[PDB]
Subunit: 76 residues, 3 copies
Amino acid sequence: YFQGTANLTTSLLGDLLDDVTSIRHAVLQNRAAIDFLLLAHGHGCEDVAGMCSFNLSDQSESIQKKFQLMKEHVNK
Amino acid sequence: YFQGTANLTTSLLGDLLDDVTSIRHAVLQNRAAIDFLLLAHGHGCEDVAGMCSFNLSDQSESIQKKFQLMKEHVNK
Amino acid sequence: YFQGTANLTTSLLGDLLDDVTSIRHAVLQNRAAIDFLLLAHGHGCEDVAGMCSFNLSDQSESIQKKFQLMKEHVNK
Ligand SMILES: [Cl-]
């Protein structure tokens, strides 16, 4: 049914949001590690494109609320 | 039609799953590279937040099967 | 309505595509940083699994056009 397709979509998006959140966290831990290494070479994060930045696209707020709204709409 | 919207959604999700899988793999290769560098400074991965961990959110199993179920449901 | 579910889905996918694009960019900047460090140890990217590669799964073209087609179809 349409409820079928819809519920599959939200289930799937749920899993995918959680994997992407997890990916982002790892990338930022990786960047922090990199900056410690640059430090130990006597270099600052400014010596490497992007390495000072820890404010990635983080539309996490927006996505969680829309996801909730979608579920509540799709499964009620 | 609804089949239209649905088939666009699964096509798109297909591409996105493949890009996210690929991203995760790269992040884990990046972390492995980092740990080799920490090693060469005489440090262990325990000296850097997260650097020992290679078990990221990996709901890949779950997502592939739901994706398959969605396609088969959406396009049959 | 179905337009409801649909418009929520595209809004959400929009945010997610933008976050994933942003993630990928960061991972590639992280890899570039890593390679500079390997260099400073007298090693080439060939000494570390994946570190030479900057051509990640990048189905960005395909996804943007399908996303556009989906919106135009879903919200018209
Ligand atoms: Cl990374």
